[PDB]
Symmetry: C2
Subunit: 163 residues, 2 copies
């Protein structure tokens, strides 16, 4: 169903949907320290997942989301990819977004496995966007079918704004 | 006694020693395909393992061996890291080393755990240098005690040329 590099890819287990509660995680940040869902309590989150910020669509997604939602109070933008912390760090620097919150799942692939976003054929994270409320309940989700294409920014942001 | 980021680190299993046969592997190259020992059959190989090319020392190391051991007939310098293929490819273009052979272990972490180079605390690859025989026998190997320091280029380079 979902496609990557002109070919259908698969996953394992079920993916969270609107209404479900966002699964906790332990990801390595850009300064090598770990982060979990708790570190973001009391905030609404826009969970953005990309194959690798070292590629065009994934870089634009991350850049654009951080910018277009920067003016949103009580809301934080989490980017999760398989890039090493060092790759995400280089990115921030090049883009002038040193404060952007970048999370890597390289250590375990646990985030990808728990969320069923780990592509079985490539072990990279499939493109997706979540908008969680304060209770970490998913109020919006988008699993881009054609991973090699941009996500729906409008819907995502409009959803994040209404919340 | 190996350290990383100033603190001591350990591994699981036993690391290979000179005289031992290099274990096989299936790593992803920069074009996203997979390579194994079989793909460099009948050639001398300089296995340089690094924590991440998006870091100072690692960059220098990958650049040095490639330039120095360049031209060496029937000899290939295989770079292995946890860096995503995209990171390795990007680095190659920025450094002007487009023909350089980069292999990623992001998928399985199989190389790291098989060679016992997968740092238990970080799940990154410790800095090491191998010089394999045409029969894939380890004729020389160095495990940098201080992963955050450069290896013995002279010693490694001399072995390859002497092989």
């Amino acid at each position: 169903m979902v496609t990557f590099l002109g070919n259908p890819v698969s996953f394992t287990g079920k993916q969270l949907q609107v209404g479900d509660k966002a699964l906790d995680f332990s990801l390595t940040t850009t300064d090598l320290s770990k982060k979990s869902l708790a570190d973001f309590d009391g905030k609404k989150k826009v969970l953005s997942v990309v194959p690798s910020i070292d590629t065009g669509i994934c870089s634009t997604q991350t850049r654009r989301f951080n910018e277009e939602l920067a003016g949103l109070d009580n809301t934080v933008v989490l980017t999760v990819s398989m890039d090493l912390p060092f790759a995400q760090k280089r990115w921030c620097g090049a883009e002038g977004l040193d404060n952007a919150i970048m999370l890597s799942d390289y250590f375990d692939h646990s985030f990808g496995r728990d969320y069923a976003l780990l592509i079985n054929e490539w072990h990279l994270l499939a493109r997706a966007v979540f908008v969680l409320d304060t209770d970490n309940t998913i109020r919006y989700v988008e699993y881009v079918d054609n991973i090699n294409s941009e996500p729906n920014f409008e819907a995502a942001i409009a959803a994040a704004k209404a919340l």
